[PDB]
Design a protein around this ligand. Structure first.
Ligand SMILES: OC[C@H]1O[C@H](O[C@H]2[C@H](O)[C@@H](O)[C@@H](O)O[C@@H]2CO)[C@H](O)[C@@H](O)[C@@H]1O
Ligand SMILES: OC[C@H]1O[C@H](O[C@H]2[C@H](O)[C@@H](O)[C@@H](O)O[C@@H]2CO)[C@H](O)[C@@H](O)[C@@H]1O
Ligand SMILES: [Mg+2]
Ligand SMILES: [Mg+2]
Lengths: 483, 483
């Protein structure tokens, strides 16, 4: 008869780090009984590598060093099948796995290969916002991989705070998600977060109020990382002495535009940046009392909020600001020295350093004699409830990220603010920019983490963007936002 | 002694649709020998559901209807362990799986549960650009799920054509990636794409040149979906008769700005939109001859390219266009009736329909008497080489998407252009907007798919954005792009 030598691998698939998979290879068309059988693998961009071998009976068995102690080759001669039991799998093991036999066929001179079966071991996946130190965090991930053999990927999706609930809710998503604490209550209500289990010794390493920020329904639902608040950033050359009041800003802008510059530019598309002026004279989100936020008591349509917004809109009407300015426009204008001031958090300092602008960081201006009240975020890391990697995620967050070395590597990328880890926060307290962050933070308020926060931010955003644009008056906009 | 009843699940993890996983439950602290043992599961946002049960010896066995025929419960009384062999798994099976025993403990009156082990079966994942019909494609996915039981998710990441090579190269990524054919050559060079295996009967269903667009190194590396080319879109009310030449556009814009409008706005941030004017008088990417693209022969610094770019820059200098206009600015301006014309492809028609603008779609204007030459894209779908779901992806693309019903559902979301499927393209040929798409397409050129395309687009983008901005002259910009 003809040569119908055939090898058919099966059993490949998807598996998490630390998991197990059993491959099989069905052999036909030749006296398999008498042949040594081999497993190989090939990944894209790597050369093919031998993995294991087994003799005819099954009693002699050999392994590559890269899989020794983790894989076991076996065979069943009743079925002419050879098996590769793979344990303690790692991202590095991703590959097409092939079966192979040697020196058979006509004249005993030919080797045969199966078509291959795919094995895919995804990395530990982290999502963090694009304005944070994701390259420094990937360096933390490289150390984790060095120690554990498990690859870590950091991604920064656009709109990640809305994408996580939709894909975690399709049973998928990253293993670890970073965001300010305000969104996490909604994720926990939906059951998309694992409860985290730091012991008491580990809890003592971080400031208690940050733990409070990531407490929901009496449960710790994420690891607090760092405390963020907006600050007034200014060009010490353009403006040696920055103004103390929002009321000074128009005349400063006139003096500056006479010289081809402007006073102030910051992001007007996200209400996080316009909130400190809205809250300053009385605006608030949800009134907190008797240990609960009262969700029927929303302070977005009172006279203080309207006074702050009307002031902002007036700045726009007088062409001191432009309704279309967003994060990138304001950053580019400040770091090129075109505007004397901007409003931002610690993550922005990095880029200013590269800009060579001699800048200072200081207290937000007052409005009607009241401090601006920025909403204070606690950058936090939750473990996806659907993650098949929760123990690895815990090890990463506790023993790699939340260390002096881990936070330093992130902070050297984009500054974190007042880090929750006491030991490193003492080291960083000496920074005048962090001192001004903490001053603005204490004049503000911690964001709530209740599930209504999302809707709240959606309303204020609308109301700001409409009022700045003219589509609605300030009273109309805030009334629509109260609903 | 005390009650130390304990149930410990293990064995959960990540597994692809169609795959298998074996759970185990170690029982201690009670005479397991004599107890019925049960498996349950709970997903977030769903109530807990019973799954299976087994009697004391192991000979009597029962299953929920939702898992009947796919799961097998077993037990080993030497180890006081009960097992759940799960086969033909599906996204719907994602859950925390629990072991349970009933009516034991003191007074035989208590039930005990293990802590649970997570099982995660990800959907089939599709990536497609945000300007395409991803909601219509998700409807195709809903039909697929109805028929197969396998959930489909469509995501539209920002910058997906750059993200796919980085994460497919970390051994991860979506199962199916949509993009114009020009990027796929680079993906295939890197070995990130599966070879696809449509039979001849299926190949005959699509126009041969689209197959040619997704051929690399003699291999079919993706499924062609639809043929895209830019067209001139105009407001029939503002401009009953649109201009035939780029040279007419300044005087039209003066007539229009006297009335508070403008002639033309389109995306100036992506060279795809400025290319047809640059190529028109002679600009080209790579010269093709003797069956190969000559990568040492780049036509980006010749006099035709410079004449097209200088014309564009002149439009900007005379304040007929603004260097900062991108996709969203131009779309909003056209669909609000603020500008008489824009330049775009079939995906944009949907939004104009909602805008109630009475628009027409027609031939791009001529430059120095030559047709504008748009680069013609073939929207294509590749299968990730690392996907553990390649057979499902094939079934989806061939038997769901590439049908009259599948393309119709996508096309009703955002029009596809001239679809590669002959049967549906005959139905759609009657459309005057598709006729003008095909006219502009035949006056243009098919994009190459060689791996250098990426670098090519990176250079032209730079050169356009610099020249429009003033940072560089046109000659300087094109010279930098030739390198
Ligand atoms: O603008 C509403 C928005 O504000 C906050 O987001 C901040 C974030 O906390 C900072 O870390 C920084 O990344 O900028 C964001 C604003 O662009 C809330 O945390 C977020 O939930 C809310 O949507
Ligand atoms: O701008 C360079 C860019 O152009 C093409 O991308 C098009 C795409 O083909 C269309 O389908 C539509 O989505 O718009 C894109 C331009 O924004 C190339 O296909 C792409 O490789 C290239 O980077
Ligand atoms: Mg996923
Ligand atoms: Mg993934």
């Amino acid at each position: 008869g003809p040569s119908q030598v055939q090898l058919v691998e099966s059993g490949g698939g998807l598996v998490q780090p630390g998991g197990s998979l059993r491959l099989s290879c069905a052999a036909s068309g030749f006296p398999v009984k008498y042949e040594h059988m081999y497993w190989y693998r090939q990944a894209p961009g790597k050369e093919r590598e031998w993995v294991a071998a087994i003799n005819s009976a099954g009693n002699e068995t050999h392994y590559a060093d890269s899989v020794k102690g983790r894989f076991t080759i076996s065979r069943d001669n009743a079925k002419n099948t050879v098996y590769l039991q793979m344990n303690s799998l790692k991202p590095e093991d991703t590959a097409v796995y092939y079966c192979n036999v040697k020196d058979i066929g006509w004249w005993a001179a030919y080797d045969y290969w199966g078509q291959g079966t795919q094995v895919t071991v995804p990395p530990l996946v982290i999502w963090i916002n694009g304005d944070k130190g994701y390259n420094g965090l990937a360096e933390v991930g490289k150390k984790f991989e060095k120690d554990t053999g498990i690859k870590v990927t950091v991604e920064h999706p656009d709109k990640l705070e809305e994408k996580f609930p939709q894909v975690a809710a399709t049973g998928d998503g990253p293993d670890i998600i970073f965001w300010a604490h305000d969104r996490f209550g909604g994720y926990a209500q939906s059951g998309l977060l694992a409860e985290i289990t730091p012991d008491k010794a580990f809890q003592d390493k971080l400031y208690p109020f940050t733990w409070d920020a990531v407490r929901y329904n009496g449960k710790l639902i994420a690891y607090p990382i760092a405390v963020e608040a907006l600050s007034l950033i200014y060009n010490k050359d353009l403006l040696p002495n920055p103004p103390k009041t929002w009321e000074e800003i128009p005349a400063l802008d006139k003096e500056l535009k006479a010289k081809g510059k402007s006073a102030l530019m910051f992001n007007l598309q996200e209400p996080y940046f316009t909130w400190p002026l809205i809250a300053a004279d009385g605006g608030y989100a949800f009134k907190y009392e008797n240990g609960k936020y009262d969700i029927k008591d929303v302070g977005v349509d009172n006279a203080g909020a309207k006074a702050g917004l009307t002031f902002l809109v007036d700045l726009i009407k007088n062409k001191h600001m432009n309704a279309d300015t967003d994060y990138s426009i304001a950053e580019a204008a400040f770091n090129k020295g075109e505007t004397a001031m901007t409003i931002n958090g610690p993550w922005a300092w990095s880029n200013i350093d590269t800009s060579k602008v001699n800048y200072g960081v200081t207290v937000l201006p007052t409005f009607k004699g009241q401090p601006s009240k920025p909403f204070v975020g606690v950058l936090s890391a939750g473990i996806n409830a659907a993650s098949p990697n929760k123990e690895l995620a815990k090890e990463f967050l506790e023993n790699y990220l939340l260390t002096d070395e881990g936070l330093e590597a992130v902070n050297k990328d984009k500054p974190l603010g007042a880090v929750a880890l006491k030991s490193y926060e003492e080291e960083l307290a000496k920074d005048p920019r962090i001192a001004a962050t903490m001053e603005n933070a204490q004049k503000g308020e911690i964001m709530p983490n209740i599930p209504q926060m999302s809707a709240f931010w959606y309303a204020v955003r609308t109301a700001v963007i409409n009022a700045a644009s003219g589509r609605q008056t300030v009273d109309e906009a805030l009334k629509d936002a109260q609903t």
